[PDB]
Amino acid sequence: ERPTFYRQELNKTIWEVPERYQNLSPVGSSVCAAFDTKTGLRVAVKKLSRPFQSIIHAKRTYRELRLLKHMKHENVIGLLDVFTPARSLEEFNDVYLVTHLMGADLNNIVKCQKLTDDHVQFLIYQILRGLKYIHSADIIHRDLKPSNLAVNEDCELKILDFGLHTDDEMTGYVATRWYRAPEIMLNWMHYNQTVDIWSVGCIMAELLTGRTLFPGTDHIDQLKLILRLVGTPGAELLKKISSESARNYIQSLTQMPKMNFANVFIGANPLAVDLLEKMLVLDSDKRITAAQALAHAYFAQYHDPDDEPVADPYDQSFESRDLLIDEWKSLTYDEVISFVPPP
Numbered sequence: 537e538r539p540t541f542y543r544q545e546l547n548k549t550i551w552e553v554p555e556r557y558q559n560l561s562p563v564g565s566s567v568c569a570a571f572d573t574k575t576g577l578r579v580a581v582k583k584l585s586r587p588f589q590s591i592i593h594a595k596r597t598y599r600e601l602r603l604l605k606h607m608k609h610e611n612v613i614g615l616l617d618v619f620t621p622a623r624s625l626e627e628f629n630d631v632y633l634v635t636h637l638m639g640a641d642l643n644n645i646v647k648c649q650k651l652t653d654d655h656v657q658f659l660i661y662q663i664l665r666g667l668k669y670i671h672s673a674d675i676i677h678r679d680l681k682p683s684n685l686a687v688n689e690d691c692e693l694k695i696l697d698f699g700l701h702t703d704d705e706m707t708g709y710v711a712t713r714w715y716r717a718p719e720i721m722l723n724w725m726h727y728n729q730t731v732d733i734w735s736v737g738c739i740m741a742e743l744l745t746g747r748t749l750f751p752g753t754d755h756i757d758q759l760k761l762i763l764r765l766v767g768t769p770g771a772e773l774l775k776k777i778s779s780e781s782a783r784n785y786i787q788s789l790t791q792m793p794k795m796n797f798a799n800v801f802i803g804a805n806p807l808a809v810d811l812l813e814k815m816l817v818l819d820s821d822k823r824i825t826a827a828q829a830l831a832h833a834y835f836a837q838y839h840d841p842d843d844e845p846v847a848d849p850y851d852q853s854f855e856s857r858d859l860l861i862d863e864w865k866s867l868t869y870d871e872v873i874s875f876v877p878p879p
């Protein structure tokens with residue numbers, strides 16, 4: 537049955553959460569840290585802003601809830617709890633999500649400086665293990681980056697924000713665009729799962745060197761940095777770019793050959809370099825997958841084929857379905873009500 541709910545103003549809104557959650561303190565984007573007296577765990581509790589203000593919001597709310605309920609994996613943010621203080625569907629208008637409070641994002645550990653090769657192995661291994669599970673369910677993260685990768689004190693890693701930016705926040709000299717596969721940055725085509733492997737490659741590079749790999753001052757500048765490294769596209773890839781405007785623009789660019797990665801990442805483990813060359817491939821059909829990357833020699837100390845699970849089938853037929861706000865709300869309510877907390 538329904539626990540007692542208390543109220544509290546925190547992020548300029550009043551948070552009505554069950555009594556078990558105490559010592560709520562804001563931590564950013566809205567999310568609060570709290571202590572779960574019921575489990576003894578420190579938790580992150582997320583309140584969604586106007587979940588059913590439009591069709592899009594209602595759908596996105598349902599999407600998020602659906603994604604987090606499905607995901608059960610060490611390297612993927614999992615749901616400890618979801619609640620609403622509403623007793624009926626008629627009163628339903630607030631959704632709260634609960635997970636582990638994580639110590640630090642990847643940005644905070646990197647801190648301009650380099651990391652040891654063993655550290656980089658463990659961290660990239662965990663992202664890839666997470667990604668393989670996510671991808672096995674035909675879910676793409678689409679926005680992998682250091683601030684989306686959260687870590688504990690033993691350097692155990694979870695992926696956040698999978699499967700879920702405006703026009704201006706993607707503009708200029710911003711970490712929001714630096715990890716984006718050029719196909720999706722420039723809308724070249726219907727994009728596949730390997731957009732995420734491009735992001736891993738960006739992240740891995742930064743971990744080895746302590747520096748951003750493609751720190752573009754804008755979309756076009758970032759593209760130039762990318763083609764400098766990996767070379768301009770050949771005939772086969774140009775055909776695959778569906779946007780004619782985009783195809784025509786690349787075809788304006790002076791041809792450049794792929795660089796020597798050994799000479800770019802001086803001093804780095806040659807297995808790292810090799811792996812990097814397979815991730816940072818312009819044509820997305822030819823990029824290495826998370827499954828294949830996990831069997832690469834670079835991870836020989838961590839790789840265990842029987843300890844790298846795939847996800848249960850994910851039904852996302854809802855994605856191409858047009859419902860009314862009320863209908864999205866009703867679906868979301870059923871998912872809240874039916875949730876079963878993990879052991």
Ligand SMILES: C[C@H](CS(C)(=O)=O)Nc1ncc2cc(Oc3ccc(F)cc3F)c(=O)n(C)c2n1
Nearest residue numbers: 563565580581582633634635637638639640641
């Ligand atoms: C990396 C931060 C460091 S700290 C303690 O300084 O804030 N730790 C952390 N730990 C957990 C989260 C969880 C989130 O979103 C959630 C995602 C799912 C959920 F069920 C609940 C959530 F709060 C979410 O956006 N962020 C930014 C989180 N951040």
